[PDB]
Design a protein around this ligand. Structure first.
Ligand SMILES: CC(=O)O[C@H]1C(=O)[C@@]2(C)[C@H]([C@H](OC(=O)c3ccccc3)[C@]3(O)C[C@H](OC(=O)[C@H](O)[C@@H](NC(=O)c4ccccc4)c4ccccc4)C(C)=C1C3(C)C)[C@]1(OC(C)=O)CO[C@@H]1C[C@@H]2O
Ligand SMILES: Nc1nc2c(ncn2[C@@H]2O[C@H](COP(=O)(O)OP(=O)(O)OP(=O)(O)O)[C@@H](O)[C@H]2O)c(=O)[nH]1
Ligand SMILES: Nc1ncnc2c1ncn2[C@@H]1O[C@H](COP(=O)(O)OP(=O)(O)NP(=O)(O)O)[C@@H](O)[C@H]1O
Ligand SMILES: Nc1nc2c(ncn2[C@@H]2O[C@H](COP(=O)(O)OP(=O)(O)O)[C@@H](O)[C@H]2O)c(=O)[nH]1
Ligand SMILES: [Mg+2]
Lengths: 433, 451, 388
């Protein structure tokens, strides 16, 4: 029996986790009080993937909420699904990291990490067959990025053979809510590239673009962003819980999509997405889902895939459908856009189909893409990093907590090396003289 | 007592087994619950045949099946499905992770600790069986448990049993269509085991079945259910000889004798002639000549390969229904008079013929039309190498840069296994190329009378 | 300049257990080619490989084409010591499964008539210097010894609590390890004593093959530095080079060693590290190829160095203006045939040159062919001259 332990660090991680748990509770028909009031029998067939059982037929999610600021904890508990979580799992401190990775990783988080790992170990020892972990957080922030990377390192030390997943919100080109985003993001990438099996790559820019141009929302808020992230986060693990014609475990995705150990940064996406009034003008078919999945504007990483080539992609479909349509459509996508796919992989489209659609839809699909174009994102951060590091713009706050410049140099070098392992396998090969 | 054991490994094997066992239950009149109202209504009979089903004192009939898979979900569907009472409670499910499209994981790491339990039941069935005829192993290339676990199981079965025939039904990767990136690695890796240990391997390709469904059956959007039903019909036609009476009955040993000229060329293609919808069932005669001609058409082959690019080493036709030997003889002669069908000069006979009286049955809710006659053809030819050649090409394109190798070597394998598998496949292709060559140009030395 | 690879494969004699048993030899070698026959398939057709050096130490008292220890040293170690004195890094990799001959190759025996690579290298290093020691030529030698186990670094010499050391990247000096004990040495005896103390601390495991097998790659780093006094008031460091001596663990298969738990984890990590290292060394040789072939290409490409800690720490020695050599040990016993073949498949790396077809016509048929050709030639001569 596969099952996953969920962790959420920082304000962004906590918000996305709250929306995710609301979505999953609705999918499985779990009341906010924890009781079950669903209809289908299949909902309980794999409830253990995300929940533990209590005495009174109540189901407690396997969540571990961590943050150094009690305000987000109070906001989460005073909410629609605040009471669902175990109170003992609300581990937190005071005197937040203050948008400082050094405080989050070396000074303030170093004390709370013991309690966090204690709760994680308690949840892990009761597992039947632990598959992997899922950490939701943001890299450009403070306590979130630092404590997330520290927990990743500790858990990978303790559980080397388990899959690790991280859904990270990075900085963006234009929208930037914090001054010191480059340093934090750089150190976070330095940790993540070394200590993670799969990383999913999202930024606020692409979510806003999706909300405005596709969903046509006049005044989007963080709820809608977290809703989209929850949709893809549920789609990625849909195959663990419900049956299907062709199953897809997390390990299957890891094996198919990671050609080499260091290239495990993915661009997610979700389909269908329509703006209410247009819903009656569209026909829901497999070609439409494929067209919207491979559309560049639907990508959630704000990296144009047309400025690069796909090393691998995965399509997790949900709903009743014909396998011939899926195979033909993916083959057509590979053949038509021949120049946008790496050529030394004969077929670079993993496909899986689950027979249970979402609650309110006849069909749905989740797209994942490992492509070179992601380099661009790293390059942007690198530029900003050097622009702040040549003059030592905001470095004294970091060095005051015990860090040194050599760590910054290491992180910059590691990102530069990663950017290359993506170009190497890009530009079409050629001859010489 | 012509009794065989059906083993199903992997998701593809399990779904194929579901379709097949539906077909056998319909054929023999056994209901899902496992009982047999036919005997109660009539009074008795041998319809509860020992070939697939074992009878107990309470009148219940249990199949001689062994379902195996690492994912709980695929067979947890079966335990909660229509046929929950048909099978034994034991279903041999590892409550652990899947092989993850990894031959090494399915063979070395997780394939252990289950191979014992599986082999123990494969015994409690063999010991219960008497006069065992053979094993029918269902799986699929390109999968983790469908490649590694099947390899380990075939190795252990060869070590233990040895002389019993082990027929293999498997799904090969298609030329264009695929549903995983690491299919070539698994398929090439398992080639050694399916070459050394299996006695005869019947191979199918999903693209060919999709084409047959689209063209002949007028199903614009097929699914795995229809392909599984077609494969089930193939297996039913194969095994119908040792269940029902017939003018000419063909056992498995005769399949091995006729379709295997040499030990390493035991890879015959298969096909089913009267694949036709109910609407097109009319306006057609479906005579013996028509089905015999349709068997040899390149379009109707179940593997995407052209027989016209190679020579036929051997052929075996199994007819079901109202068939009399005059028409099969005439059809064989008519086929022999055609130029496009080339036969190796060293096999002048080139045909095995079997006839059975029991006509094919129709699955309720299916798509095949009810017919009076049918034929299943097996064809050992040299065209199959072409398909293998395509697969070989893909492997090099993924092995030149050692992509996806760290996953395999992290579970127990080394690059030497990859090199050995590639060399073995190249040797097999060379053997297929050599055997298809004509006999020595007439060694007409023109010796003049006495030396 | 770049860095080329010298691949040498050597075969050892029998031991007491093999001599007592009636096992047959299976490795034939000639020139730069090594042929192996399957004991189980007498007609399997022999499999051949080709390397840069092919050493026949199978017959101990041999006098024709005998691969003496000093001969191998003159082939590899002397050239590497000369390159090191020039001020460029040199790396020596050892490979071979347990019972192959790695330890003999890297250490030698105590009678000092058949010495390993390291003793001869140390003796020549100390001698060459003691001679060049003038008034403006100061020399300094230091030694470090570490182990890599499950991608974690450990100090062998230090008796402290064997924790995991951290790996850092100095911007100019490249990768290095923090809190790694570094000691100076004065003679080969001190080096041998330090090596013995370190080897006693190595992580060793018992397998189905042998009760003592290496579970962790090891690195014995020799750092050599030269200070020059020119015709001036200043004494300046001329150059600093490194002689790296590594004991790469051997590859394996789960079938050969069916141990579960920790043993399988160690084997998986060793296989991953060896695959990565093979990738790096072959890719680094790819440079040679391409470069020499055309004459210029620039694009440094990207040689994967961060995929494993072993290749990361050995980055400076492997790449740049340096040299690397690879010595693989072979077992002659028939019973170990597959393992020997595996070593050959690992020894085929770092170039993958073409060994071509290997076959010999029957000697009787050779004589028949030669006699028929001679008869034809002599008959033609006699008929042309009119005497036949
Ligand atoms: C009733 C009906 O037919 O209308 C649809 C609808 O109009 C559309 C536009 C819905 C609608 O979604 C949105 O408007 C939306 C806004 C911001 C961010 C995300 C969504 C819908 O709200 C969303 C809602 O979706 C669901 O019910 C899914 O099960 C969804 N549910 C939740 O996320 C959820 C929300 C609140 C509380 C608990 C769960 C889901 C998706 C993936 C995985 C699990 C669940 C549906 C059917 C509709 C409305 C109501 C208008 C869409 O919803 C999704 C992502 O499934 C947006 O594009 C799709 C396609 C639909 O056509
Ligand atoms: N014809 C047919 N093929 C199937 C079916 N299900 C899966 N397959 C084939 O199986 C291949 C994938 O490998 P599988 O054997 O299914 O993998 P698995 O059995 O789940 O084993 P793991 O990969 O280790 O989980 C695909 O290429 C499919 O074509 C089916 O129901 N019918
Ligand atoms: N050229 C040689 N001449 C004589 N004996 C040799 C020679 N090469 C190796 N040996 C023998 O090899 C043995 C030592 O090496 P051996 O123990 O086989 O390697 P190993 O240590 O087991 N492999 P590893 O543990 O991975 O380093 C001794 O018995 C030596 O006599
Ligand atoms: N999607 C989403 N992103 C958020 C939300 N709140 C903050 N962020 C992002 O997170 C970044 C700030 O990180 P923060 O949460 O303060 O890190 P922390 O203080 O360590 O927990 C900003 O750049 C925002 O883009 C939210 O509700 N939804
Ligand atoms: Mg499976």
């Amino acid at each position: 029996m596969r099952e996953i332990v969920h962790i959420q660090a920082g304000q962004c991680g906590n918000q996305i986790g709250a929306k995710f748990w609301e979505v999953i509770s609705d999918e499985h028909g779990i009341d906010p009080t924890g009781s079950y009031h669903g209809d289908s029998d299949l909902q309980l067939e794999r409830i253990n993937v995300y929940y533990n059982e209590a005495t009174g037929n109540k189901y407690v999610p396997r969540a571990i909420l961590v943050d150094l600021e009690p305000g987000t904890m109070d906001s989460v508990r005073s909410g629609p699904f605040g009471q669902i979580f175990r109170p003992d799992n609300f581990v937190f401190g005071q005197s937040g990291a203050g948008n400082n990775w050094a405080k989050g990783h070396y000074t303030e988080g170093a004390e709370l990490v013991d309690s966090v790992l204690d709760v994680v170990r308690k949840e892990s020892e009761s597992c039947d067959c632990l598959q992997g972990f899922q950490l939701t957080h943001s890299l450009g922030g403070g306590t979130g990025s630092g404590m997330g990377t520290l927990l990743i390192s500790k858990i990978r030390e303790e559980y080397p053979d388990r899959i690790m997943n991280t859904f990270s919100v990075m900085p963006s080109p234009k929208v930037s809510d914090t001054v010191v985003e480059p340093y934090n993001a750089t150190l976070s990438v330095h940790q993540l590239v070394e200590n993670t099996d799969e990383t999913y790559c999202i930024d606020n820019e692409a979510l806003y673009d999706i909300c405005f141009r596709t969903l046509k929302l006049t005044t989007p808020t963080y709820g809608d962003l977290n809703h989209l992230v929850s949709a893809t986060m549920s789609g990625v693990t849909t195959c663990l819980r419900f049956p299907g014609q062709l199953n897809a475990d997390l390990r299957k995705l890891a094996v198919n999509m990671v050609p080499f150990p260091r290239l495990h940064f993915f661009m997610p996406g979700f389909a269908p997405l329509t703006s209410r009034g247009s819903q009656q003008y569209r026909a829901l078919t497999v070609p439409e889902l494929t067209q919207q999945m491979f559309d560049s504007k639907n990508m959630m990483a704000a990296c144009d895939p047309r400025h690069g080539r796909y090393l691998t992609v995965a399509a997790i479909f949900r709903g009743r459908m014909s396998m011939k349509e899926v195979d033909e459509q993916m083959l057509n996508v590979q053949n038509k856009n021949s120049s946008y796919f790496v050529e030394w992989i004969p077929n670079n489209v993993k496909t899986a189909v689950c027979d249970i659609p979402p609650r309110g839809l006849k069909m749905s699909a989740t797209f994942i893409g490992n492509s070179t174009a992601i380099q661009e994102l790293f390059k942007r951060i690198s530029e900003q990093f050097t622009a702040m590091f040549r003059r030592k713009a905001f470095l004294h706050w970091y060095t005051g907590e015990g860090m040194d410049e050599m760590e910054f140099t290491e992180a910059e070098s590691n990102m530069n090396d990663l950017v290359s392992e993506y170009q190497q396998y890009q530009d079409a090969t050629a001859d010489e003289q | 007592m012509r009794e065989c054991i059906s083993i199903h490994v992997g998701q593809a094997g399990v779904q194929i087994g579901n379709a097949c066992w539906e077909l056998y239950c319909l054929e023999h009149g056994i209901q899902p619950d496992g009982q047999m109202p036919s005997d109660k209504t009539i009074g008795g009979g041998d319809d509860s045949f020992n070939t697939f089903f074992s009878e107990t004192g309470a009148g219940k009939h249990v199949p001689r099946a062994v379902f195996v898979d690492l994912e709980p979900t695929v067979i947890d569907e079966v335990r909660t499905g229509t046929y929950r009472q048909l099978f034994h409670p034991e279903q041999l499910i590892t409550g652990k992770e899947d092989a993850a499209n990894n031959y090494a994981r399915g063979h070395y790491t997780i394939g252990k600790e289950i191979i014992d339990l599986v082999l123990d039941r494969i015994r409690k069935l063999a010991d219960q069986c008497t006069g065992l005829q053979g094993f029918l192993v269902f799986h699929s290339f390109g999968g983790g448990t469908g490649s590694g676990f099947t390899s380990l199981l075939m190795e252990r079965l060869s070590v233990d049993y040895g002389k019993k025939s082990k027929l293999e039904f498997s799904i090969y990767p298609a030329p264009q269509v695929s549903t995983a990136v690491v299919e070539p690695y698994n398929s090439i890796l398992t080639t050694h085991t399916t070459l050394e240990h299996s006695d005869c391997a019947f191979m199918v390709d999903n693209e060919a079945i999709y084409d047959i469904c689209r063209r002949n059956l007028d199903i614009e959007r097929p699914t795995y259910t229809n392909l599984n039903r077609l494969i089930s019909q193939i297996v039913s036609s194969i095994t119908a000889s040792l269940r029902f009476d017939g003018a000419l009955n063909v056992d498995l040993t005769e399949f091995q004798t006729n379709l295997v000229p040499y030990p390493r060329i035991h890879f015959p293609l298969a096909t089913y002639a009267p694949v036709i919808s109910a609407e097109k069932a009319y306006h057609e005669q479906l005579s013996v000549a028509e089905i015999t001609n349709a068997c040899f058409e390149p379009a109707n082959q179940m593997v995407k390969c052209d027989p016209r690019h190679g020579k036929y080493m051997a052929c075996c036709l199994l007819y079901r229904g109202d068939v009399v030997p005059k028409d099969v003889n005439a059809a064989i002669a008519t086929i022999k008079t055609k130029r496009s069908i080339q036969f190796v000069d060293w096999c002048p006979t080139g045909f095995k013929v079997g006839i059975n009286y029991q006509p094919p049955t129709v699955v309720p809710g299916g798509d095949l039309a009810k017919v009076q006659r049918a034929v299943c053809m097996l064809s050992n030819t040299t065209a199959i190498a072409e398909a293998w050649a395509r697969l070989d090409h893909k492997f090099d394109l993924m092995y030149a840069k050692r992509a996806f190798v760290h996953w395999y070597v992290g579970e127990g394998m080394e690059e030497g296994e990859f090199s050995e598998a590639r060399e073995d496949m190249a040797a097999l292709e060379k053997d297929y190329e050599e055997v298809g060559v004509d006999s020595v140009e007439g060694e007409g030395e023109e010796e003049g009378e006495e030396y | 300049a770049g860095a080329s690879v010298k691949v040498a494969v050597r075969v050892r004699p029998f031991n007491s257990r093999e001599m007592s048993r009636d096992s047959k030899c299976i490795i034939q070698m000639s020139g730069s080619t090594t042929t192996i026959v399957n004991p189980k398939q007498p007609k399997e057709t022999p499999k051949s490989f080709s390397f840069d050096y092919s050493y026949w130490s199978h017959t101990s008292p041999e006098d024709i084409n005998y691969a003496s220890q000093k001969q191998v040293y003159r082939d590899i170690g002397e050239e590497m010591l000369q390159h090191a004195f020039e001020g460029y890094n040199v790396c020596i990799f050892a490979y071979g499964q347990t019972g192959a001959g790695k330890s003999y190759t890297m250490m030698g025996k105590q009678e000092k008539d058949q010495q390993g690579i390291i003793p001869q290298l140390c003796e020549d290093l100390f001698s060459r210097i003691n001679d060049t020691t003038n008034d403006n030529m100061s020399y300094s030698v230091e030694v470090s010894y570490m182990e890599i186990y499950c991608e974690r670094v450990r100090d062998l010499l230090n008796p402290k609590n064997k924790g995991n050391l951290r790996v850092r990247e100095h911007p100019l000096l490249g990768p290095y390890v923090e809190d790694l004990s570094k000691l100076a040495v004065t003679s080969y005896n001190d080096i041998q004593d330090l090596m013995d103390s370190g080897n006693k601390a190595r992580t060793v495991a018992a397998t189905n093959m042998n009760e003592t097998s290496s579970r962790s790659h090891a690195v014995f780093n020799i750092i050599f530095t030269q200070k020059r006094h020119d015709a001036e008031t200043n004494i300046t460091t001329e150059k600093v080079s490194k002689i790296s001596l590594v004991d790469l663990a051997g590859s394996e298969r789960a079938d050969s060693t069916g141990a579960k738990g920790t043993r399988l984890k160690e084997g998986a990590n060793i296989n991953k590290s060896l695959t990565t290292l093979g990738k790096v060394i072959s890719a680094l040789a790819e440079m040679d190829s391409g470069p020499n072939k055309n004459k210029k290409k620039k694009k440094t490409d990207f040689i994967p160095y961060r995929d494993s800690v072993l290749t990361w720490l050995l980055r400076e020695n492997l790449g740049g203006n340096s040299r690397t050599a690879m010595v693989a040990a072979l077992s002659p016993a028939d019973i170990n045939y597959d393992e020997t073949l595996s070593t050959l498949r690992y020894a085929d790396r770092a170039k993958q040159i073409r060994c071509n077809a290997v076959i010999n016509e029957d000697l009787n048929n050779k004589l028949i062919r030669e006699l028929k050709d001679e008869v034809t030639r002599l008959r033609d001569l006699l008929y042309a001259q009119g005497l036949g």
